[PDB]
Every structure is written in C-alpha cells, then in structure tokens.
Amino acid sequence: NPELVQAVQHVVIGPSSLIVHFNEVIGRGHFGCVYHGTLLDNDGKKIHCAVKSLNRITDIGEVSQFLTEGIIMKDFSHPNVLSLLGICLRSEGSPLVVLPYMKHGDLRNFIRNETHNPTVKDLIGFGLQVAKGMKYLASKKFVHRDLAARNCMLDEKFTVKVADFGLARDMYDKEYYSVHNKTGAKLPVKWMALESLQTQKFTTKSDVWSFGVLLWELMTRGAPPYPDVNTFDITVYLLQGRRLLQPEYCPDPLYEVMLKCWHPKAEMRPSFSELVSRISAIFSTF
C-alpha cells in the first residue's frame, strides 16, 4: 500500500546510519529480539538506541498489517510515552524499529529489584507518570490493550514511558499470556477487563482496568496478580465481584482508586484525566 510506504517514508533511517549489536540482546519478543544499537544523527553524532527486530514476521501480509497498525506512533509525542526514532528498511530482512534506549529497563523488574527498594512515594509517583502517559494516548483515541508494569520502561532520568505499543508491540514475558480465552490467542488475561474477556473488545475503559492492575503491581513491588487463580477461572472470579486485595503498603485512598478502575460497568470507571487528578492529590500527601 503506497499510503503506508509514504507514512513509513517519513521516518526512514538509512542502513549506514544504524549500527546494530546482534550479540547484545536487551530482550526477547515473539516477532524478534531487541538489541543494543547506535544511531548516527544527521550531525554525525552517536546515539544509543534500542533496535527491535521484526524478522520473525516473514509474511508480507503480516508485515503490512503490523506496520499499518503501528505507524501512527510517529505522530505521538509525550514525556510518558515511548517515542519512535525511526524505521530502518533494508534489502534483506524485515524492517527494524528504532527506539530511544531505556537505561533502567522495564518498570516491573525495576521495582522488584531489592537493592532499589522504592518507597511508597516513589511507587505512587511512577503510577502517576503512567496515568499521564495514558491520558495522552487516550486523548489520541489510542487503545493500548496490553498495559502492565512489565510494559512500561524507565529512561536515564527515571521518567516512566508507556512502551510495548504500535511498532514496539510484542509479547516480552510469555509467562503472563494465556490462550485460555475466547480468542484462542496468547493474551494477558489477568490484566484484562471483564467485558474484554467476555466480548473480546478493548477500549480506553478496559485500559483503565489494566491501569488499576498496574497500580496494584506497583504497590506490591511487582507481585504477580491472582497467583492462586487459574487462567481458567479469571472470568468467573471477576463475575462473582471478586477483585485484587489491598496491598499492605497501599494507602486506603489509592485502593479505592484501584477498585473504581475495576467497576463492572466500563462507563462508571474513571477517565485517565480523573485518575491523574486523584493520584496526584494522593502523591502530594507524601
């Protein structure tokens, strides 16, 4: 599709401007791995970046669909949303997606790291950053569909970026994706809103549900949600009105925010704008 080529054409990176270190794997996805790279800017300067391979996507129809769904991220710009540096097209291999290097890695491993020992205040602050990132995406009518602590990254300044979307979308920790759902594909069922598990539909309001789970992850420092609930049972567990329990170090007002995020009626759940307001107030009491 020439319209797609055109869009891709806006962000193309020449092969001679990119050095990929294929022996330095940052992470592994289903479409390909992420590698350390260096991008040479027009000024000739060296920029450390992350290079996402899509080489496991060999079918031209699949490559086209993936690029089509993801290319819009080139129009996004917000401090709490992962940006796209560009796309390297080549004679052999699927396109390479080039992104800013995130020096501190994914949020979940960061808070699980026992030497870090983030405080309640630190954790709420990260959650606030995610809420602002999602408020921006939501304002662009963009539904993430896989929001979770594992899928947010931290840059050198400890700014949290919502990642794993658009051209950067993949499954980066397979342990938390199950085919026990209506679509039969690997999905993050324990982050999914009840109505998404039932109807297979995703909206900004189901992103709000996932954000609620992400908040729970933050306050438990990266504990796995519903560890004693089988993937077979997650739908009925929720239908019964049951929810994740309040974390020991989660303040009562923040747990109320979580519960609001998991209201059975999607329209009754807060917007991300509301969430930024409420969480900001809570944060500032610290």
Ligand SMILES: Cc1ccc(Cl)c2c1NC(=O)/C2=N\NC(=O)[C@@H](C)c1ccc(O)cc1
């Ligand atoms: C749990 C986990 C393990 C490994 C990897 Cl690679 C990732 C996650 N979770 C992610 O979201 C993710 N990667 N997500 C991304 O957007 C990719 C494109 C990316 C990776 C490293 C960068 O410095 C910059 C961007």
